[PDB]
């Protein structure tokens, strides 16, 4: 169960029906839902976001943060057919997450689960299996060198 080329092409194709707009509203709503799920399942992680004002989920800071995530994921997926560049960006994102203490691999497994829970609610014909097989690949690279 690796991340096949078909899986990557699939994800790339379905991706423009999950958010993707000249406006950030869908990104905010969906990413927001992903984190509501994450915090519901791993509430300890919610403390890691006070810098971006999780306590006030309608704040510009938190919105802008969600958009930062969404666009980060966008960047990752867009790089699926450019493995070298994907590797560099993956490393970059990883270090960005190492600077933040308290962020664990377990939290990443968690967010994978919440993504998998949220995406099929916002778009039909979303290949969940493909998503899982590929996310494992992305996260395992981002979240290595973090506390287990």
């Amino acid at each position: 169960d690796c991340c096949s080329a078909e899986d990557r092409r699939e994800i790339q194709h379905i991706w423009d029906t999950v958010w993707s707009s000249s406006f950030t509203d869908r990104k905010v709503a969906i990413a927001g839902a992903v984190f509501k799920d994450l915090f519901h399942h791993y509430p300890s992680a919610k403390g890691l976001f006070e810098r971006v004002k999780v306590a006030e989920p309608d704040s510009g800071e938190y919105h802008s943060h969600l958009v930062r995530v969404a666009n980060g994921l966008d960047l990752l997926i867009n790089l699926f057919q450019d493995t070298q560049v994907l590797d560099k960006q993956l490393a970059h994102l990883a270090e960005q997450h190492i600077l933040r203490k308290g962020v664990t691999q377990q939290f990443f497994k968690g967010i994978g689960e919440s993504f998998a829970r949220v995406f099929p609610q916002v778009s039909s014909c979303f290949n969940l299996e493909a998503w899982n097989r590929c996310f494992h690949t992305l996260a395992d690279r981002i979240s290595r060198d973090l506390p287990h």
């Binding site: 169960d1 690796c2 096949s4 080329a5 078909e6 990557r8 057919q81 493995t83 070298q84």
Partner: protein
Amino acid sequence: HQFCCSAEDRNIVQKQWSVLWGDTESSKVKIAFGRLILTKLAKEIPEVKELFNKVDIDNPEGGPFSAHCLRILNALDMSINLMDDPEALDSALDHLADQHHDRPGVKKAHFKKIAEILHTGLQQVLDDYNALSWKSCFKGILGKIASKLQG
């Protein structure tokens, strides 16, 4: 089976591999690349160099070693081109495993290393290189070749 070295994975690998051999002196390039890979392997794991004594690795510019680099590169080319036909590929790779079994001193760790070296080199020479597909497939290929090794 699918997912790990899938159909499209194999298509990508073949298409990208095809880029290297454009001109009439493909032999020169195969020899150069094979020589690079092998000598790099002998540097990384020094105990390996002795295993190539019968192909005159001490004179890598020499005849015998050049012909040998052609041997490995052509085996690699063959196995890549055979990825359309899994059964035939499996048979060829099995023959290779047999051949590497008859060379005592060859170990799986050597194949792990040569995998690393191979991917590192291919990232350079190939302008378009899908690491996911290549690694997915070669895990299986090199796996099968090293499958009959004692150590």
